[PDB]
Every structure is written in C-alpha cells, then in structure tokens.
UniProtKB/Swiss-Prot annotation, chains A, B:
GO cellular component entries: axon cytoplasm; cytoplasm; cytoplasmic vesicle; cytosol; dendrite cytoplasm; dense core granule; extracellular exosome; extracellular region
This protein's name: Superoxide dismutase [Cu-Zn]
rRNA-binding among keywords: no
Other noteworthy facts: The protein (both wild-type and ALS1 variants) has a tendency to form fibrillar aggregates in the absence of the intramolecular disulfide bond or of bound zinc ions. These aggregates may have cytotoxic effects. Zinc binding promotes dimerization and stabilizes the native form.
Gene of this entry: SOD1
Function: Destroys radicals which are normally produced within the cells and which are toxic to biological systems.
Impact noted for substituting K122E: Mimicks constitutive succinylation state; decreased activity
Reactions catalysed, as given in the entry: 2 superoxide + 2 H(+) = H2O2 + O2
Phosphoserine PTM sites in chain numbering: S98, S102, S105, S107
Length: 153, 153
C-alpha cells in the first residue's frame, strides 16, 4: 500500500495525526486518525493546494482543485478534489476520523502528497449555504491546524 | 517550473525555510534559503525517506535511497538520492543555503515531494569516514530540524 500521514499543528490547542492508506493505486484512499483540542461538533476538513507552511496555514492556499470546479461535499460530482467534508468532534474535543474517498489519491494527478491537510473552525456547508463563499470554502471559517501530507511507511 | 518548500523546525532553536525550483523535469533542482540557530561550521543536509513527523525528526527514517546505494556526497555516483551534502553556518548561526542538484527531482521516482528535509548536528563526512556509520549517514549526528517538503507556487 502507498501510505501517507499528515501531522496537524496550529497556533491553538488543535493537533492530531491523520493516516492515509491506498492499497491499490486505482482504488480509494482510507483516512483515519485523531484530532484533539476541538470544540464539539462539525469541522470542515480539506486538502488544500500547497504544502507551504511559511505563514502557518494561510500559505496552504485554497482547496486542491485541479479540475477547476466549485466547492461541494465529497459525495457530490461538483467538488474540489480536496473536499473531504466534515469531521465530528465529541464532547471531549476529540474527532476520531474515519473517511474513505475515491477522488483523492496518493499518486497521479489527484495526488495529495506534498499538499496541506487543514481542519477548520466551523462546519463545511458542502456548497449549500447560498453564497459565493459557500462555493469556494463551504464557509468552514478559519484554519485551526494543518500539516503537509507526507509519504509514510 | 514546479516549486516546493520545506519549513524546518525542531525542539531547539534551529529553524529555516528552504526553497526548491525545477524549471524542467529532468533539469537540475535549485535549492536555496536560510537556516538560523545553527552552530558555526558544517552541517549535514539530507532528504530522508518519509514525510512522517509523528515522532519528530526521528520518524523521517533513513536517507532517501530508492537505488539502494551507499551514502556519499552530492558529487559522487555512489550516493543516496537524498544526499545533498553539507550546509555552512556563519558566526551569527546562519546558513545561507545555495545548492544545485540533478539527482533529486520534484517529480517521478526521484521526487522529494512529501519527504523530509533534515539538517544535522555535525558535518557529513560524505561517506569517507571509514566506519560503518559513514556509509549510512555520513556521521552527521543528531537531527536538529526537519520539514516535510511541500508543493509551492
Ligand atoms: Cu480547508
Ligand atoms: Cu539526514
Ligand atoms: Zn472545496
Ligand atoms: Zn545518505
């Protein structure tokens, strides 16, 4: 399996380790791990275009979007490659992430290797919020923690 | 030109930003930037195999070595792909890095995207130290700071 990992860090208490596994290069990516230091509820969760951490999470740029589409949820045809939707933190502040996605890859043009995984302040509205922002970022708000996605063993 | 960047951090004071530019795939990669908080002198500088920051610099693994060769200097035919040799810190603790290398790439099999750049405590002996450690790490010692190499604009 190609395997990857992103270690999320930010200026606040949010931190975690997200694993990626893709046993077959033409199959889906499994995404799992823990994020702690979160407020309870839903948090936007995306792969952004750049693996650039020179100005914290800001320099990651927008959502990874090689096909130049509008923001959506991961179940939508109209989405960014990087749109993984939401993760859910429990009342103890821990999101135990478990996602499977067939649009991102660990190889090829849709590869997220060397790109930044970001967990956001608020819920991703999945492009249904009735404004321009909904259609670019899902209104998920500010970037709480991020990590460059790296090749793992 | 693909571009990449690594932001180096560790537990101590060592930190910097390293840029990569490769105008042509199969052309040389230019490597430049600045690392501060170093002791004056030579410091080993390598791309390691994994972009895995879960246990700090230790989980980056060994030098990036897809051709299974012995450790060397960047001018040697017998080297690891990740062997970028030494960088030099002036008396104010700053290494102004400026390197061109044609063995690493920002794409293909020798791509360092998603892999960890590491700067070391001691000088790399470029595989000429006559012990077993020399042919693996160059006796560069401990890992002061590291960063996952990410895609930049
Ligand atoms: Cu995002
Ligand atoms: Cu090294
Ligand atoms: Zn999006
Ligand atoms: Zn080496």
């Amino acid at each position: 399996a190609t395997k990857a990992v992103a270690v999320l860090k930010g200026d606040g208490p949010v931190q975690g380790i997200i694993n990626f596994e893709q046993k077959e290069s033409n199959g889906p990516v499994k995404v799992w791990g823990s994020i702690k230091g979160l407020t309870e509820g839903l948090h936007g969760f995306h792969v952004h275009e750049f693996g650039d951490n020179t100005a914290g999470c800001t320099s990651a740029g927008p959502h990874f979007n090689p096909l130049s589409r509008k923001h959506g949820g991961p179940k939508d045809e109209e989405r960014h490659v990087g749109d993984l939707g939401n993760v859910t933190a429990d009342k103890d502040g821990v999101a135990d992430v478990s996602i499977e996605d067939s649009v991102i890859s660990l190889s090829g043009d849709h590869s997220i290797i060397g790109r930044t995984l970001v967990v956001h302040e608020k819920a991703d509205d999945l492009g249904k919020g009735g404004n321009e922002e909904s259609t670019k970022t899902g209104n998920a708000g500010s970037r709480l923690a991020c990590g460059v996605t790296g090749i793992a063993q």
